[PDB]
Amino acid sequence: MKIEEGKLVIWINGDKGYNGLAEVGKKFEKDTGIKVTVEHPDKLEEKFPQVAATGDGPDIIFWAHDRFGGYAQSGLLAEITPDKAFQDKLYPFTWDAVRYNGKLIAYPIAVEALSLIYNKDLLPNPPKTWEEIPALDKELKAKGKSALMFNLQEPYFTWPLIAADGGYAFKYYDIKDVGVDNAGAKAGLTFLVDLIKNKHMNADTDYSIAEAAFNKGETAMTINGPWAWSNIDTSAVNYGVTVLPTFKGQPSKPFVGVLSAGINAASPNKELAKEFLENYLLTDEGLEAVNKDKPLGAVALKSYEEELAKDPRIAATMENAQKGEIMPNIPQMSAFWYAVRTAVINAASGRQTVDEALKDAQTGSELYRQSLEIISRYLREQATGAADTAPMGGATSRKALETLRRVGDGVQRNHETAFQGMLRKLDIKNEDDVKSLSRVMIHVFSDGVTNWGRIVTLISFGAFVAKHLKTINQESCIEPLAESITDVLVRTKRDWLVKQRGWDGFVEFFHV
Numbered sequence: 001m002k003i004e005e006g007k008l009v010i011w012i013n014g015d016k017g018y019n020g021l022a023e024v025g026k027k028f029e030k031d032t033g034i035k036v037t038v039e040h041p042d043k044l045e046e047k048f049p050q051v052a053a054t055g056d057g058p059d060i061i062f063w064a065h066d067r068f069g070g071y072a073q074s075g076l077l078a079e080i081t082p083d084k085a086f087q088d089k090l091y092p093f094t095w096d097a098v099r100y101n102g103k104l105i106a107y108p109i110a111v112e113a114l115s116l117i118y119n120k121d122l123l124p125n126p127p128k129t130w131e132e133i134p135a136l137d138k139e140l141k142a143k144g145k146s147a148l149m150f151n152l153q154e155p156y157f158t159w160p161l162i163a164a165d166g167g168y169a170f171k172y173y174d175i176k177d178v179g180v181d182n183a184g185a186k187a188g189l190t191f192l193v194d195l196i197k198n199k200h201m202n203a204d205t206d207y208s209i210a211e212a213a214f215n216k217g218e219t220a221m222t223i224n225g226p227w228a229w230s231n232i233d234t235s236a237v238n239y240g241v242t243v244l245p246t247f248k249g250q251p252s253k254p255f256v257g258v259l260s261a262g263i264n265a266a267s268p269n270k271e272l273a274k275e276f277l278e279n280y281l282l283t284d285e286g287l288e289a290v291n292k293d294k295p296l297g298a299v300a301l302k303s304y305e306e307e308l309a310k311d312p313r314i315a316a317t318m319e320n321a322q323k324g325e326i327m328p329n330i331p332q333m334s335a336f337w338y339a340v341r342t343a344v345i346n347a348a349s350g351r352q353t354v355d356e357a358l359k360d361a362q363t364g365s366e367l368y369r370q371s372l373e374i375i376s377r378y379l380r381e382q383a384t385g386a387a388d389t390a391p392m393g394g395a396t397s398r399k400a401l402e403t404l405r406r407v408g409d410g411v412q413r414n415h416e417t418a419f420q421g422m423l424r425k426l427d428i429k430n431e432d433d434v435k436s437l438s439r440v441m442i443h444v445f446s447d448g449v450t451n452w453g454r455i456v457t458l459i460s461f462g463a464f465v466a467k468h469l470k471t472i473n474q475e476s477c478i479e480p481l482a483e484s485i486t487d488v489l490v491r492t493k494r495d496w497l498v499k500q501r502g503w504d505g506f507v508e509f510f511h512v
């Protein structure tokens with residue numbers, strides 16, 4: 001296996017207290033003789049699933065809890081085994097954040113929420129509403145200052161505004177219901193794009209540009225998390241931390257993250273990782289080391305949270321958190337963030353209109369579930385000979401299914417001999433063999449030009465396999481088969497599918 005035994009490699013994001021974490025690691029090495037290496041690679045949240053899937057990577061990965069369902073579903077995280085007495089040292093709602101499919105899949109460290117951070121010497125009374133920002137910027141611009149700069153390249157930072165007047169990710173979790181292009185989301189993003197059109201913000205502003213501007217005293221406000229506070233202390237800007245402005249009378253709703261530590265499932269060092277996490281990091285002295293480097297927010301460790309909760313910055317953090325929501329941890333969170341990131345960037349730049357951007361995001365976010373509904377229904381009715389009587393809950397699903405029935409009948413008829421021969425060559429007998437189908441379908445499906453004819457052929461093969469599985473009394477393998485096909489299709493063809501307008505495109509192409 002790629003990972004080395006008898007040491008710990010930790011990955012953590014570069015905005016967090018990695019030097020303090022390394023200090024904890026030195027203490028661990030002094031007591032145990034085991035060397036701890038902390039790294040902060042770029043795009044670690046994308047890198048981790050690529051390397052961990054091959055049995056490589058770090059022993060411990062730190063990130064907000066939202067990405068970890070995905071990791072867990074993919075087999076990349078060890079289940080953790082804190083005993084009762086350890087469990088009781090952290091807040092139950094922090095453990096709830098790192099529960100997937102009933103199992104604990106990470107240790108919670110700290111609760112993060114975005115707040116409004118403001119320069120008390122420029123703006124002694126910060127605005128309660130978004131709507132008053134344009135006027136305030138006009139006033140500040142007369143003195144060579146701006147009202148507000150924040151990172152527009154990561155949707156995390158814009159989401160509180162998008163969500164304020166009723167935007168939402170997944171309904172509280174009903175995965176069918178995405179609220180990315182409803183009228184509330186549209187309103188929020190239109191307000192953001194108007195700020196930009198009226199020269200109150202610049203589309204190119206990123207994390208670094210906003211942080212420098214605030215920390216040099218050029219802009220009166222930023223939006224950021226507790227990790228930013230250290231660098232402002234150093235700058236000698238006199239700052240406060242407050243509740244985010246309202247929009248159309250409603251609170252900004254930040255997406256709340258629980259910084260968490262997961263154990264790589266390929267690690268031969270799981271017991272050392274546990275010892276590090278429970279007996280060195282999640283203690284008063286351990287969290288203090290990290291916190292002194294870059295503040296964590298409101299920590300999951302009750303003993304130390306009682307001291308931090310007296311800080312008015314932490315109170316503000318908790319106030320904003322209470323108005324927002326805990327992020328979901330479902331495997332499609334990754335696709336939701338990619339889709340919303342693109343939408344914000346394209347709306348802010350003018351590359352798409354607000355309505356066009358958010359339509360594309362809504363299609364990207366729901367792609368996996370929508371594809372699965374269609375493909376699973378088709379596979380099961382082909383296998384059994386009868387359709388599923390439940391409603392879709394679904395206009396696109398229903399028409400796409402109708403289309404697939406019409407087109408797929410022809411394909412399965414014409415390809416029957418070839419499909420017979422391919423199935424005989426692959427010998428799919430049970431759930432273990434459906435696992436092996438993925439590698440073959442990626443190769444055969446991907447190494448080929450993409451068009452809807454080829455997608456129908458893939459799904460038609462699926463249906464033909466489903467009928468065989470039913471005949472051999474393996475009907476319980478049909479759902480996993482459908483999941484596997486949907487996985488190959490959407491992992492490899494996502495961008496083409498979105499550009500083709502998803503399943504509405506399919507329906508239009510074969511209309512005919």
Ligand SMILES: CCc1sc2ncnc(N[C@H](CO)C(=O)O)c2c1-c1ccccc1
Nearest residue numbers: 418419422440441444445454455457458461
């Ligand atoms: C794993 C079996 C699969 S998956 C798939 N996906 C798209 N096209 C296919 N075939 C068409 C026409 O055969 C193509 O390559 O354009 C296939 C075949 C498949 C099934 C039987 C024989 C050859 C390929």
Ligand SMILES: OC[C@H]1O[C@H](O[C@H]2[C@H](O)[C@@H](O)[C@@H](O)O[C@@H]2CO)[C@H](O)[C@@H](O)[C@@H]1O
Nearest residue numbers: 013015064066067154155156157257337
């Ligand atoms: O922008 C989408 C992004 O948001 C969250 O990432 C936060 C992270 O939680 C914080 O710890 C801080 O580091 O800033 C990040 C924003 O750049 C999600 O946790 C993440 O999965 C998502 O891609």
Ligand code: NA
Nearest residue numbers: 013042043044
């Ligand atoms: Na990053």
